[PDB]
Amino acid sequence: AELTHKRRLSALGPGGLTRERAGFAVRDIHPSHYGRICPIETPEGPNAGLIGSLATHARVNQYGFLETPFRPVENGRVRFDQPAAYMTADEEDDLRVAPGDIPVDENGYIIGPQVPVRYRQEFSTTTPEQVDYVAVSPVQIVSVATSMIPFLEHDDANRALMGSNMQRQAVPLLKPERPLVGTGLEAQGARDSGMVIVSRTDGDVVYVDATEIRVRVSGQLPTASGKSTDNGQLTSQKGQEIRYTVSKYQRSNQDTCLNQKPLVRIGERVVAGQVLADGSSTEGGELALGQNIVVAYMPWEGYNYEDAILISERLVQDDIYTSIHIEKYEIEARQTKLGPEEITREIPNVGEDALRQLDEQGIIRIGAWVEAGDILVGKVTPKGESDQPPEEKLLRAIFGEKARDVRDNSLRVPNGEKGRVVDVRLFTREQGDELPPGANMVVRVYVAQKRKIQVGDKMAGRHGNKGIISRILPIEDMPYLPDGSPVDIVLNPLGVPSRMNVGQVFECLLGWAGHTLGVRFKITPFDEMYGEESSRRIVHGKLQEARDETGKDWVYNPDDPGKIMVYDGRTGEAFDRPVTIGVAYMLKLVHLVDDKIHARSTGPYSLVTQQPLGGKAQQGGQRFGEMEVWALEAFGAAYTLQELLTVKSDDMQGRNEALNAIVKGKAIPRPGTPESFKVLMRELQSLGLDIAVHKVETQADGSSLDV
Amino acid sequence: MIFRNRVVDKGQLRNLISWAFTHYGTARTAVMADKLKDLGFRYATRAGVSISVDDLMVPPSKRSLLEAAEEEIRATEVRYQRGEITEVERFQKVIDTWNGTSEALKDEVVTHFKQTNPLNSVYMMAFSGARGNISQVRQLVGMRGLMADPQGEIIDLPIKTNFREGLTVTEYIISSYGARKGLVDTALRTADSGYLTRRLVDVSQDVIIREIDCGTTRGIPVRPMTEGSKTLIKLSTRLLGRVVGEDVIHPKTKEVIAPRNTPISDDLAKEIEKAGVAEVVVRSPLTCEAARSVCQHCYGWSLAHAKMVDLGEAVGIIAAQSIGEPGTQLTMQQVRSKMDGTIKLPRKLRTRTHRTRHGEDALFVESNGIMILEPRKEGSETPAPQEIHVTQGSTIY
Amino acid sequence: QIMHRAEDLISAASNRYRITVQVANRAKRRRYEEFESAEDAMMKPVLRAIIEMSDELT
């Protein structure tokens, strides 16, 4: 992401456009865009078509205009030996112009009998005479994630978009893993991110302690190349000296987390500015996104039939697919002009069972396990009883004790918070609390948890994808292989042909390989070799030998050029038709049911409408849709409606009435009457309204006091 | 007690379910097509199925029958060169070309499948019934029908293949625009879909049945919706969920029926229209006298009641949503029938007159007419593959 | 069954709503009438309501 978000751009701007009066062309595209910005970038929202992808290669000038190279071809001869190849800034040349690739012979000579190539927004045909500018490379129209697609060459554009924006905001994952399969463009980009650290300078590491790697005050040869051919405003002056601390699991601006990793073992040479730190998601300067997984597509007993992922419990035991998150909680105390209050170290009804793993103000011990409605730390609040509630004075004195309302809304961590606590930053008057004034002392502290994936996890891929899962499953029942291993991701099978995204196969496949013969690829997409379905050629190939040398030579069948067999029914029969399987790059997302859960039974209504309120909170309005109140009358029978407004909206005494009725063994009655109504009526009456609202069976009707 | 044995499809589900619930207590039959339905699964499972790659099969003319089309241009443009006969002109051809041959290209793929694997996955999806359709398969296997550019026309570069081989760059961006278009309005007709049946409900609201007794002899008869040739609407199924007080007089060959009042029910239909008779009135609402409402009797069985609706329901509010709310799917042959360079009578073809100029060169003149079975072009008068001398029209595209 | 063949009674008894409504009317009272936890009423008040309709609805 922080790639991309380095560099989207828009025209939202003070300066920019409306977001609805900037009507259409605004939205479209423009062959300038070709090579200048990527089309696969689009939030597909009411604020989309406004996010310049920034040419994967562009650069810009003092006039802002961006660059997009136009590589010269001396009427038949390119080889990139010619000059220019570095401009077409924001525009062109009125040279009918060479698209990215085309059968580029050895040293250039550029076969295409008669090649199509772009004049200006147009793309006529002409051959080595008249062109000369052409790819740098076969992808000058991408933006950080639209490159992930290993073989988008084989996947529809309308198809490639949100899927390519999935990894754009992927979740991290405790234990990372390069992909498998290879198009490989990125490693570097990972270094651009910063999560991974290259020498600032140089060295050959001494003890590379997890906490402290060092050409730091090493005293050693991370030093010395840390002085390789040394430099001066850099202190080579003494056994070199490149100090900097790695990061643990810190709350990202989105509560995401990552702690990098001491990668390069000791005393093992380095080289300037080469990534040696393994952060979030690289092993080694590559994009750790997902893992690599066998995938037999298979409409089995359902549990998935679009969309609908199924996976085998192993995933959990695999110890992979393990988020972790850590998020603020904080709390503070006022100093009430009502008569100030502090935190406590307790007040009543405190278990020490509550109050225990607590600390010395009330405070909560760190590195301490918490779980559900846990207790942070001890707010102490004011709430006198001047107008002692009717029972009050007595009850108090009647039950038999004289307590006092010194109160305590001390912090109770939300339920399900089974997270060990993991830091705290915290401070009071003294440093000068840099404090929101009127306020006494910071209480911010928080927690994470290792937390493995579950159901409804928006996991999928990186090219036209979006997935969730029912159920997971006994490592055994799930289908397995003639080699004898059990597989670990169904799919459905129809998905993909329909998504018109084919290649997912491809990888499956390719990967297969990988996995069978530890094969790497990191090769730009788009079969351009020879200029046809070489891909194919690849696949079957790297198959071929792989299975040839695989010994069993079953992982491939001449009669199954891309299939496999599927003996593995409920009791492991032979499923029937040899069905294809292989290795995909399942990548999970955030929309975790946890932060995306929601349900509650009433609580605080609003103020104004005094209606409860759903800003997606623990007490979040079951939200509501009148499009349904425009579909809930199609059967009518009021009642639900009647309630269905009332008493859960206006009527106080309704709502409550309810509460009772049930716990009061009473037939919850009869609406209140709404009131918000009355509220609306009030402002109207003032706006200049009048209403006699009234009975009429009454003496000449009248004006029933509905106020 | 009634065994059926054919193949199954979607529809024969569909219907099936019907014919069950049509005579069986809703739940009693609503519960059906659930155990056997979930058994869809477990079988399908057992058969099991999935793609291949070359699942993406390509009817291997494809290479050929394509490059066939390729010469098409060759002449259109490698010969127009003399300007002698001209630019926008055959231009108007070449584009014509591509899509045309193309349909022939498909047409190969059509039969090509048809008899490639009776047990074919790609086929077992679709022509069965499944997520696969025809345009879908086309650009899965068949060449991708040439479309349009960024604006209401098509950039020089056209769509080109199925996937398999994949795509160079050009068309991909060309297509990227295609999407992003699609994108964008996808958005805006959110608004449309929203307003649809929203302000329409605001007029369809407060219409409620009060009255059945309503004495009404008013109403309008139909014929099936009936574009030209084709039976636009079945009617043997369309005229249902309603009643009629003026009855059926088939050629007095038959005997009057559905006396009045008569809850037009199905059989009654399918027969009385497929059987032989073809026209009558009703009793619908644009009639029946009613107070801020419609005569029940001028209603019928709705489209869920499966029987005379009750009364006291804002039918309109629902009658609204049923139109635009789903209409959102608005844009802005398959299951194989005879052939697909489609319907056409005997023996001449349409060329336009300034702007095609290559020779051999023309846009799309309106259909001429007189539907001929097993198409051939523009004429009349009974050809050989099937025999009839009747008619006009053509689901021809 | 627990609830399934109940798709016909309401279906074939003049105004359906109307039915419901009465049926409640049962309901409400025919819980109400007995607040002694009579296990007959251990189950939901409707469903009885229903059924003893049902099987008087012959």
Binding site: G636, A638, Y639 | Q205, D206, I208, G312, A314 | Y17
Partner: peptide, 21 residues
């Protein structure tokens, strides 16, 4: 108006009572 009373919470017409009356 079903919605007229909806703005309120009178029940609607289009519900037993609208005719049971």
């Amino acid at each position: 108006g079903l919605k007229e009373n909806v703005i309120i919470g009178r029940l609607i017409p289009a519900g037993t009572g609208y005719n049971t009356y």
